[PDB]
Amino acid sequence: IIGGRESRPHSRPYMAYLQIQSPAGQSRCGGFLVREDFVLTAAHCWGSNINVTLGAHNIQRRENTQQHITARRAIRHPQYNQRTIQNDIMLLQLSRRVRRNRNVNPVALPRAQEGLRPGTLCTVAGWGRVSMRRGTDTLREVQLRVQRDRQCLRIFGSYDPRRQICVGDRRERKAAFKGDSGGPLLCNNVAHGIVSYGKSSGVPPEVFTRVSSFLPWIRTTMRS
Ligand SMILES: COC(=O)N(C)Cc1c(C(=O)O)n(Cc2cccc3ccc(F)cc23)c2ccccc12
Ligand SMILES: [Zn+2]
């Protein structure tokens, strides 16, 4: 998170830290618990082995609040496209259910035709980089404003407002950045978006997946 603050410890108990391994090496992402057995994140966070930590604030130290669960299944959207970064959404089936408590519980999703309009203020949280090269051990957060479609259409050739949200005022040094991928955009306590991508500079606007567009695929997947 660029330009943010340390979160109040355990104030966002839906937050998941992902440690990802594949032949391509090690990666880090965020994610969020949407049911006792499922975490939602981005498809570009896929790996052959993913371990999830819930209940964390400082993910570099042991805390008896943490729950460590390997993902039994990593289900990318069937039309996820690496090249355009379209349909950037993935469900993790946990190998066991979490023990729900003050520090570990799910977050609500939007309704289908509810919407999210320019000018809405939201929060994004994660363990990602705070500048170009430096990181953090502890969860951080920042408030970002929803931008108009054209502000992303102008700078991102493959942007589609049917499936993506445009986020962050270029006037402020405030953004989700590397390490924050997969984490939630919370608006009025609901997870409307998923951190997807942006410019290497970290200067907004940036691109989130629009959850409302994938609700059918989400529901069908979790039901089966
Ligand atoms: C297996 O996992 C991985 O390979 N990864 C997690 C690496 C990866 C990241 C990442 O480091 O988070 N991002 C997000 C991203 C990258 C660059 C600029 C950004 C600016 C703003 C922003 F909010 C996000 C940005 C990706 C996007 C697409 C593909 C891969 C990645
Ligand atoms: Zn604590």
mmCIF file of N, CA, C and O in Angstrom, residues 57-144:
data_model
loop_
_atom_site.group_PDB
_atom_site.id
_atom_site.type_symbol
_atom_site.label_atom_id
_atom_site.label_comp_id
_atom_site.label_asym_id
_atom_site.label_seq_id
_atom_site.Cartn_x
_atom_site.Cartn_y
_atom_site.Cartn_z
ATOM 1 N N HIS A 57 -1.589 -10.008 11.677
ATOM 2 C CA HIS A 57 -1.294 -8.591 11.534
ATOM 3 C C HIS A 57 0.156 -8.432 11.085
ATOM 4 O O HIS A 57 0.412 -7.878 10.026
ATOM 5 N N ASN A 58 1.099 -8.945 11.875
ATOM 6 C CA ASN A 58 2.487 -9.020 11.451
ATOM 7 C C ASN A 58 2.767 -10.427 10.926
ATOM 8 O O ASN A 58 2.954 -11.352 11.716
ATOM 9 N N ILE A 59 2.818 -10.580 9.592
ATOM 10 C CA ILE A 59 2.898 -11.899 8.980
ATOM 11 C C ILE A 59 4.316 -12.467 9.058
ATOM 12 O O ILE A 59 4.523 -13.609 8.655
ATOM 13 N N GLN A 60 5.282 -11.690 9.567
ATOM 14 C CA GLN A 60 6.656 -12.164 9.721
ATOM 15 C C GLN A 60 6.910 -12.784 11.097
ATOM 16 O O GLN A 60 7.956 -13.394 11.291
ATOM 17 N N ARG A 61 5.967 -12.640 12.037
ATOM 18 C CA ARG A 61 6.102 -13.187 13.382
ATOM 19 C C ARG A 61 4.946 -14.142 13.685
ATOM 20 O O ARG A 61 3.863 -14.002 13.120
ATOM 21 N N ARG A 62 5.191 -15.109 14.588
ATOM 22 C CA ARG A 62 4.154 -16.004 15.084
ATOM 23 C C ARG A 62 3.150 -15.216 15.919
ATOM 24 O O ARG A 62 3.540 -14.391 16.740
ATOM 25 N N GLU A 63 1.854 -15.483 15.720
ATOM 26 C CA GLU A 63 0.835 -15.041 16.662
ATOM 27 C C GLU A 63 -0.214 -16.146 16.769
ATOM 28 O O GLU A 63 -0.587 -16.736 15.760
ATOM 29 N N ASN A 64 -0.706 -16.389 17.990
ATOM 30 C CA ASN A 64 -1.610 -17.502 18.244
ATOM 31 C C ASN A 64 -2.983 -17.229 17.628
ATOM 32 O O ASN A 64 -3.867 -18.081 17.702
ATOM 33 N N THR A 65 -3.159 -16.050 17.011
ATOM 34 C CA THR A 65 -4.388 -15.725 16.304
ATOM 35 C C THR A 65 -4.372 -16.294 14.884
ATOM 36 O O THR A 65 -5.429 -16.413 14.275
ATOM 37 N N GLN A 66 -3.188 -16.653 14.356
ATOM 38 C CA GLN A 66 -3.056 -17.041 12.954
ATOM 39 C C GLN A 66 -3.601 -18.449 12.705
ATOM 40 O O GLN A 66 -3.467 -19.336 13.550
ATOM 41 N N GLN A 67 -4.240 -18.622 11.540
ATOM 42 C CA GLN A 67 -4.627 -19.929 11.029
ATOM 43 C C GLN A 67 -3.986 -20.133 9.658
ATOM 44 O O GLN A 67 -4.213 -19.338 8.744
ATOM 45 N N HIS A 68 -3.198 -21.212 9.537
ATOM 46 C CA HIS A 68 -2.456 -21.534 8.325
ATOM 47 C C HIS A 68 -3.086 -22.742 7.627
ATOM 48 O O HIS A 68 -3.040 -23.860 8.150
ATOM 49 N N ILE A 69 -3.652 -22.513 6.435
ATOM 50 C CA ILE A 69 -4.393 -23.526 5.699
ATOM 51 C C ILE A 69 -3.894 -23.551 4.256
ATOM 52 O O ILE A 69 -3.840 -22.515 3.606
ATOM 53 N N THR A 70 -3.523 -24.735 3.755
ATOM 54 C CA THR A 70 -3.136 -24.864 2.355
ATOM 55 C C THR A 70 -4.408 -24.875 1.511
ATOM 56 O O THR A 70 -5.445 -25.353 1.965
ATOM 57 N N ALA A 71 -4.341 -24.304 0.300
ATOM 58 C CA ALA A 71 -5.452 -24.355 -0.642
ATOM 59 C C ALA A 71 -5.490 -25.721 -1.327
ATOM 60 O O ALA A 71 -4.524 -26.114 -1.981
ATOM 61 N N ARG A 72 -6.630 -26.418 -1.195
ATOM 62 C CA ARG A 72 -6.835 -27.714 -1.819
ATOM 63 C C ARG A 72 -7.074 -27.566 -3.323
ATOM 64 O O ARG A 72 -6.679 -28.438 -4.090
ATOM 65 N N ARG A 73 -7.733 -26.475 -3.728
ATOM 66 C CA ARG A 73 -8.015 -26.184 -5.125
ATOM 67 C C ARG A 73 -7.808 -24.688 -5.382
ATOM 68 O O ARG A 73 -8.201 -23.849 -4.570
ATOM 69 N N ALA A 74 -7.183 -24.367 -6.522
ATOM 70 C CA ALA A 74 -7.041 -22.989 -6.973
ATOM 71 C C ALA A 74 -7.759 -22.845 -8.309
ATOM 72 O O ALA A 74 -7.228 -23.242 -9.346
ATOM 73 N N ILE A 75 -8.972 -22.278 -8.256
ATOM 74 C CA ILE A 75 -9.883 -22.261 -9.388
ATOM 75 C C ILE A 75 -9.896 -20.867 -10.017
ATOM 76 O O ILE A 75 -10.569 -19.955 -9.538
ATOM 77 N N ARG A 76 -9.144 -20.727 -11.110
ATOM 78 C CA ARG A 76 -9.156 -19.522 -11.914
ATOM 79 C C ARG A 76 -10.434 -19.464 -12.744
ATOM 80 O O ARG A 76 -11.000 -20.495 -13.075
ATOM 81 N N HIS A 77 -10.884 -18.241 -13.059
ATOM 82 C CA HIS A 77 -11.950 -18.033 -14.021
ATOM 83 C C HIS A 77 -11.545 -18.716 -15.325
ATOM 84 O O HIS A 77 -10.394 -18.570 -15.741
ATOM 85 N N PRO A 78 -12.450 -19.477 -15.991
ATOM 86 C CA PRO A 78 -12.102 -20.174 -17.236
ATOM 87 C C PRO A 78 -11.659 -19.306 -18.415
ATOM 88 O O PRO A 78 -11.030 -19.812 -19.344
ATOM 89 N N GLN A 79 -11.980 -18.006 -18.389
ATOM 90 C CA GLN A 79 -11.608 -17.111 -19.477
ATOM 91 C C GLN A 79 -10.556 -16.095 -19.034
ATOM 92 O O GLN A 79 -10.358 -15.097 -19.720
ATOM 93 N N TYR A 80 -9.856 -16.374 -17.922
ATOM 94 C CA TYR A 80 -8.742 -15.544 -17.481
ATOM 95 C C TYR A 80 -7.688 -15.498 -18.591
ATOM 96 O O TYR A 80 -7.292 -16.529 -19.142
ATOM 97 N N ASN A 81 -7.244 -14.276 -18.912
ATOM 98 C CA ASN A 81 -6.317 -14.026 -20.006
ATOM 99 C C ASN A 81 -5.080 -13.321 -19.458
ATOM 100 O O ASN A 81 -5.168 -12.163 -19.062
ATOM 101 N N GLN A 82 -3.930 -14.010 -19.478
ATOM 102 C CA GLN A 82 -2.681 -13.457 -18.968
ATOM 103 C C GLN A 82 -2.296 -12.185 -19.725
ATOM 104 O O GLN A 82 -1.851 -11.204 -19.127
ATOM 105 N N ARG A 83 -2.435 -12.234 -21.053
ATOM 106 C CA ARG A 83 -1.933 -11.192 -21.936
ATOM 107 C C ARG A 83 -2.656 -9.857 -21.715
ATOM 108 O O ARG A 83 -2.008 -8.814 -21.718
ATOM 109 N N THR A 84 -3.987 -9.887 -21.567
ATOM 110 C CA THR A 84 -4.775 -8.666 -21.384
ATOM 111 C C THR A 84 -5.076 -8.411 -19.905
ATOM 112 O O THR A 84 -5.508 -7.317 -19.562
ATOM 113 N N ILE A 85 -4.851 -9.417 -19.051
ATOM 114 C CA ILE A 85 -5.204 -9.386 -17.633
ATOM 115 C C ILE A 85 -6.713 -9.179 -17.477
ATOM 116 O O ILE A 85 -7.152 -8.445 -16.591
ATOM 117 N N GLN A 86 -7.503 -9.838 -18.330
ATOM 118 C CA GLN A 86 -8.956 -9.822 -18.227
ATOM 119 C C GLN A 86 -9.441 -11.055 -17.466
ATOM 120 O O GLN A 86 -8.789 -12.104 -17.461
ATOM 121 N N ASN A 87 -10.609 -10.910 -16.833
ATOM 122 C CA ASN A 87 -11.228 -11.956 -16.026
ATOM 123 C C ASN A 87 -10.278 -12.389 -14.908
ATOM 124 O O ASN A 87 -10.130 -13.585 -14.640
ATOM 125 N N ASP A 88 -9.685 -11.394 -14.232
ATOM 126 C CA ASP A 88 -8.661 -11.606 -13.222
ATOM 127 C C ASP A 88 -9.315 -11.877 -11.868
ATOM 128 O O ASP A 88 -9.473 -10.966 -11.059
ATOM 129 N N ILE A 89 -9.679 -13.145 -11.638
ATOM 130 C CA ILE A 89 -10.394 -13.549 -10.436
ATOM 131 C C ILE A 89 -10.203 -15.058 -10.243
ATOM 132 O O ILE A 89 -10.179 -15.804 -11.221
ATOM 133 N N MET A 90 -10.037 -15.482 -8.979
ATOM 134 C CA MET A 90 -9.759 -16.872 -8.633
ATOM 135 C C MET A 90 -10.309 -17.199 -7.243
ATOM 136 O O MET A 90 -10.199 -16.399 -6.309
ATOM 137 N N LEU A 91 -10.899 -18.394 -7.118
ATOM 138 C CA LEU A 91 -11.374 -18.885 -5.839
ATOM 139 C C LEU A 91 -10.427 -19.963 -5.323
ATOM 140 O O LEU A 91 -10.032 -20.862 -6.068
ATOM 141 N N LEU A 92 -10.087 -19.850 -4.036
ATOM 142 C CA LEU A 92 -9.321 -20.868 -3.341
ATOM 143 C C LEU A 92 -10.252 -21.657 -2.427
ATOM 144 O O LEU A 92 -10.847 -21.094 -1.507
ATOM 145 N N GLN A 93 -10.383 -22.959 -2.698
ATOM 146 C CA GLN A 93 -11.004 -23.869 -1.747
ATOM 147 C C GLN A 93 -9.972 -24.259 -0.685
ATOM 148 O O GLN A 93 -8.910 -24.811 -0.993
ATOM 149 N N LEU A 94 -10.288 -23.938 0.577
ATOM 150 C CA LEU A 94 -9.415 -24.258 1.696
ATOM 151 C C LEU A 94 -9.493 -25.760 1.962
ATOM 152 O O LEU A 94 -10.557 -26.363 1.831
ATOM 153 N N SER A 95 -8.355 -26.345 2.353
ATOM 154 C CA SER A 95 -8.269 -27.779 2.614
ATOM 155 C C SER A 95 -9.049 -28.160 3.877
ATOM 156 O O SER A 95 -9.455 -29.304 4.031
ATOM 157 N N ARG A 96 -9.245 -27.197 4.784
ATOM 158 C CA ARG A 96 -10.172 -27.346 5.896
ATOM 159 C C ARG A 96 -10.858 -25.999 6.133
ATOM 160 O O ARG A 96 -10.359 -24.961 5.697
ATOM 161 N N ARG A 97 -12.008 -26.029 6.809
ATOM 162 C CA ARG A 97 -12.722 -24.814 7.168
ATOM 163 C C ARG A 97 -11.957 -24.073 8.260
ATOM 164 O O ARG A 97 -11.320 -24.690 9.105
ATOM 165 N N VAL A 98 -12.026 -22.738 8.227
ATOM 166 C CA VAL A 98 -11.475 -21.913 9.291
ATOM 167 C C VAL A 98 -12.312 -22.095 10.560
ATOM 168 O O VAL A 98 -13.486 -22.455 10.489
ATOM 169 N N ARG A 99 -11.686 -21.852 11.718
ATOM 170 C CA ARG A 99 -12.413 -21.632 12.961
ATOM 171 C C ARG A 99 -12.763 -20.147 13.057
ATOM 172 O O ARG A 99 -11.883 -19.296 13.192
ATOM 173 N N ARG A 100 -14.062 -19.846 12.958
ATOM 174 C CA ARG A 100 -14.541 -18.475 12.918
ATOM 175 C C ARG A 100 -14.434 -17.862 14.311
ATOM 176 O O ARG A 100 -14.777 -18.500 15.304
ATOM 177 N N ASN A 101 -13.926 -16.627 14.370
ATOM 178 C CA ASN A 101 -13.812 -15.904 15.627
ATOM 179 C C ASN A 101 -13.646 -14.414 15.329
ATOM 180 O O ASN A 101 -13.750 -14.002 14.177
ATOM 181 N N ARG A 102 -13.362 -13.629 16.377
ATOM 182 C CA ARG A 102 -13.134 -12.193 16.283
ATOM 183 C C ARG A 102 -12.101 -11.837 15.217
ATOM 184 O O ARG A 102 -12.206 -10.773 14.626
ATOM 185 N N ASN A 103 -11.104 -12.705 14.999
ATOM 186 C CA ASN A 103 -9.955 -12.387 14.165
ATOM 187 C C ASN A 103 -10.043 -13.032 12.779
ATOM 188 O O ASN A 103 -9.242 -12.676 11.922
ATOM 189 N N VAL A 104 -10.975 -13.984 12.587
ATOM 190 C CA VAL A 104 -11.145 -14.715 11.336
ATOM 191 C C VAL A 104 -12.638 -14.859 11.043
ATOM 192 O O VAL A 104 -13.309 -15.655 11.694
ATOM 193 N N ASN A 105 -13.160 -14.091 10.070
ATOM 194 C CA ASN A 105 -14.518 -14.302 9.581
ATOM 195 C C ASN A 105 -14.705 -13.641 8.213
ATOM 196 O O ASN A 105 -13.941 -12.752 7.840
ATOM 197 N N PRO A 106 -15.716 -14.078 7.418
ATOM 198 C CA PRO A 106 -15.877 -13.619 6.034
ATOM 199 C C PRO A 106 -16.423 -12.201 5.845
ATOM 200 O O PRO A 106 -16.989 -11.608 6.764
ATOM 201 N N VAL A 107 -16.265 -11.678 4.622
ATOM 202 C CA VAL A 107 -16.790 -10.370 4.241
ATOM 203 C C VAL A 107 -17.859 -10.562 3.163
ATOM 204 O O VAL A 107 -17.796 -11.498 2.366
ATOM 205 N N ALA A 108 -18.859 -9.669 3.161
ATOM 206 C CA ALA A 108 -19.978 -9.750 2.234
ATOM 207 C C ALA A 108 -19.557 -9.298 0.837
ATOM 208 O O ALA A 108 -18.655 -8.479 0.696
ATOM 209 N N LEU A 109 -20.247 -9.841 -0.176
ATOM 210 C CA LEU A 109 -20.102 -9.435 -1.564
ATOM 211 C C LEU A 109 -21.250 -8.505 -1.945
ATOM 212 O O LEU A 109 -22.291 -8.502 -1.299
ATOM 213 N N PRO A 110 -21.117 -7.702 -3.025
ATOM 214 C CA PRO A 110 -22.222 -6.862 -3.484
ATOM 215 C C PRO A 110 -23.372 -7.686 -4.053
ATOM 216 O O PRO A 110 -23.246 -8.893 -4.242
ATOM 217 N N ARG A 111 -24.499 -6.998 -4.289
ATOM 218 C CA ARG A 111 -25.622 -7.546 -5.033
ATOM 219 C C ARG A 111 -25.358 -7.285 -6.513
ATOM 220 O O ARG A 111 -24.502 -6.467 -6.845
ATOM 221 N N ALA A 112 -26.100 -7.968 -7.396
ATOM 222 C CA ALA A 112 -25.743 -8.053 -8.808
ATOM 223 C C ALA A 112 -25.918 -6.715 -9.526
ATOM 224 O O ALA A 112 -25.041 -6.311 -10.291
ATOM 225 N N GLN A 113 -27.047 -6.032 -9.293
ATOM 226 C CA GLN A 113 -27.347 -4.813 -10.033
ATOM 227 C C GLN A 113 -27.211 -3.576 -9.141
ATOM 228 O O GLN A 113 -27.680 -2.499 -9.497
ATOM 229 N N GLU A 114 -26.503 -3.719 -8.014
ATOM 230 C CA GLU A 114 -26.337 -2.653 -7.032
ATOM 231 C C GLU A 114 -25.517 -1.503 -7.626
ATOM 232 O O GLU A 114 -25.960 -0.348 -7.634
ATOM 233 N N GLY A 115 -24.313 -1.842 -8.096
ATOM 234 C CA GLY A 115 -23.439 -0.920 -8.805
ATOM 235 C C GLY A 115 -22.366 -0.341 -7.890
ATOM 236 O O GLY A 115 -22.398 -0.551 -6.678
ATOM 237 N N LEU A 116 -21.399 0.349 -8.511
ATOM 238 C CA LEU A 116 -20.399 1.154 -7.822
ATOM 239 C C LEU A 116 -20.010 2.316 -8.740
ATOM 240 O O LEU A 116 -19.379 2.093 -9.769
ATOM 241 N N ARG A 117 -20.383 3.547 -8.359
ATOM 242 C CA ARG A 117 -20.318 4.688 -9.262
ATOM 243 C C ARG A 117 -19.130 5.595 -8.939
ATOM 244 O O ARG A 117 -18.695 5.680 -7.791
ATOM 245 N N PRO A 118 -18.583 6.316 -9.951
ATOM 246 C CA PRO A 118 -17.485 7.264 -9.736
ATOM 247 C C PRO A 118 -17.751 8.208 -8.567
ATOM 248 O O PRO A 118 -18.887 8.630 -8.357
ATOM 249 N N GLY A 119 -16.691 8.519 -7.816
ATOM 250 C CA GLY A 119 -16.793 9.427 -6.688
ATOM 251 C C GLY A 119 -16.980 8.697 -5.361
ATOM 252 O O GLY A 119 -16.893 9.323 -4.309
ATOM 253 N N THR A 120 -17.256 7.382 -5.397
ATOM 254 C CA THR A 120 -17.435 6.633 -4.162
ATOM 255 C C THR A 120 -16.065 6.460 -3.511
ATOM 256 O O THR A 120 -15.087 6.149 -4.196
ATOM 257 N N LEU A 121 -16.013 6.640 -2.186
ATOM 258 C CA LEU A 121 -14.784 6.438 -1.442
ATOM 259 C C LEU A 121 -14.787 5.020 -0.871
ATOM 260 O O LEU A 121 -15.785 4.564 -0.310
ATOM 261 N N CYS A 122 -13.647 4.340 -1.029
ATOM 262 C CA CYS A 122 -13.470 2.957 -0.614
ATOM 263 C C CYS A 122 -12.126 2.823 0.102
ATOM 264 O O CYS A 122 -11.324 3.754 0.063
ATOM 265 N N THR A 123 -11.884 1.655 0.722
ATOM 266 C CA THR A 123 -10.596 1.332 1.321
ATOM 267 C C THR A 123 -10.054 0.044 0.694
ATOM 268 O O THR A 123 -10.816 -0.889 0.447
ATOM 269 N N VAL A 124 -8.735 0.008 0.455
ATOM 270 C CA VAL A 124 -8.023 -1.214 0.090
ATOM 271 C C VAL A 124 -6.932 -1.460 1.135
ATOM 272 O O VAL A 124 -6.329 -0.511 1.638
ATOM 273 N N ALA A 125 -6.683 -2.746 1.440
ATOM 274 C CA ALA A 125 -5.706 -3.160 2.436
ATOM 275 C C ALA A 125 -4.825 -4.295 1.898
ATOM 276 O O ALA A 125 -5.260 -5.082 1.056
ATOM 277 N N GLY A 126 -3.587 -4.371 2.410
ATOM 278 C CA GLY A 126 -2.654 -5.422 2.021
ATOM 279 C C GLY A 126 -1.275 -5.267 2.669
ATOM 280 O O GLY A 126 -1.011 -4.280 3.366
ATOM 281 N N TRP A 127 -0.428 -6.285 2.431
ATOM 282 C CA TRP A 127 0.937 -6.371 2.934
ATOM 283 C C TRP A 127 1.955 -5.990 1.855
ATOM 284 O O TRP A 127 3.137 -6.320 1.989
ATOM 285 N N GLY A 128 1.503 -5.288 0.805
ATOM 286 C CA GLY A 128 2.336 -4.968 -0.344
ATOM 287 C C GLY A 128 3.339 -3.844 -0.081
ATOM 288 O O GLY A 128 3.440 -3.314 1.029
ATOM 289 N N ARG A 129 4.093 -3.503 -1.137
ATOM 290 C CA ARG A 129 5.130 -2.481 -1.081
ATOM 291 C C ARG A 129 4.539 -1.102 -0.758
ATOM 292 O O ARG A 129 3.422 -0.772 -1.171
ATOM 293 N N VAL A 130 5.330 -0.302 -0.028
ATOM 294 C CA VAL A 130 4.949 1.035 0.407
ATOM 295 C C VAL A 130 5.609 2.088 -0.482
ATOM 296 O O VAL A 130 5.238 3.260 -0.423
ATOM 297 N N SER A 131 6.622 1.666 -1.251
ATOM 298 C CA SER A 131 7.227 2.485 -2.294
ATOM 299 C C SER A 131 7.691 1.561 -3.416
ATOM 300 O O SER A 131 7.257 0.414 -3.478
ATOM 301 N N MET A 132 8.559 2.061 -4.303
ATOM 302 C CA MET A 132 9.002 1.272 -5.441
ATOM 303 C C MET A 132 9.723 0.001 -4.984
ATOM 304 O O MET A 132 9.485 -1.062 -5.553
ATOM 305 N N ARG A 133 10.576 0.095 -3.951
ATOM 306 C CA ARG A 133 11.458 -1.012 -3.596
ATOM 307 C C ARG A 133 11.283 -1.493 -2.148
ATOM 308 O O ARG A 133 11.856 -2.521 -1.792
ATOM 309 N N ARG A 134 10.501 -0.802 -1.302
ATOM 310 C CA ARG A 134 10.461 -1.168 0.111
ATOM 311 C C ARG A 134 9.072 -1.680 0.507
ATOM 312 O O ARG A 134 8.053 -1.227 -0.017
ATOM 313 N N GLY A 135 9.064 -2.637 1.449
ATOM 314 C CA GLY A 135 7.863 -3.355 1.852
ATOM 315 C C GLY A 135 7.516 -3.122 3.323
ATOM 316 O O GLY A 135 8.040 -2.209 3.951
ATOM 317 N N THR A 136 6.616 -3.962 3.846
ATOM 318 C CA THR A 136 6.130 -3.888 5.214
ATOM 319 C C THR A 136 5.880 -5.309 5.718
ATOM 320 O O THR A 136 5.561 -6.197 4.930
ATOM 321 N N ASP A 137 6.002 -5.492 7.034
ATOM 322 C CA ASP A 137 5.707 -6.752 7.700
ATOM 323 C C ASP A 137 4.248 -6.796 8.150
ATOM 324 O O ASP A 137 3.705 -7.881 8.349
ATOM 325 N N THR A 138 3.643 -5.614 8.354
ATOM 326 C CA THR A 138 2.332 -5.512 8.971
ATOM 327 C C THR A 138 1.331 -4.921 7.979
ATOM 328 O O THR A 138 1.680 -4.102 7.135
ATOM 329 N N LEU A 139 0.074 -5.349 8.132
ATOM 330 C CA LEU A 139 -1.034 -4.933 7.295
ATOM 331 C C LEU A 139 -1.181 -3.413 7.315
ATOM 332 O O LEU A 139 -1.084 -2.784 8.366
ATOM 333 N N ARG A 140 -1.428 -2.852 6.126
ATOM 334 C CA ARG A 140 -1.636 -1.423 5.941
ATOM 335 C C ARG A 140 -2.886 -1.190 5.097
ATOM 336 O O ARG A 140 -3.399 -2.121 4.484
ATOM 337 N N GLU A 141 -3.361 0.063 5.056
ATOM 338 C CA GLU A 141 -4.572 0.386 4.318
ATOM 339 C C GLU A 141 -4.526 1.830 3.818
ATOM 340 O O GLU A 141 -3.773 2.651 4.331
ATOM 341 N N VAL A 142 -5.339 2.122 2.797
ATOM 342 C CA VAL A 142 -5.458 3.479 2.287
ATOM 343 C C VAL A 142 -6.846 3.666 1.676
ATOM 344 O O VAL A 142 -7.427 2.718 1.140
ATOM 345 N N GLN A 143 -7.354 4.903 1.747
ATOM 346 C CA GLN A 143 -8.623 5.248 1.122
ATOM 347 C C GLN A 143 -8.384 5.768 -0.291
ATOM 348 O O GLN A 143 -7.544 6.640 -0.492
ATOM 349 N N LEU A 144 -9.151 5.216 -1.246
ATOM 350 C CA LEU A 144 -9.078 5.586 -2.653
ATOM 351 C C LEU A 144 -10.479 5.908 -3.177
ATOM 352 O O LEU A 144 -11.460 5.278 -2.778
#
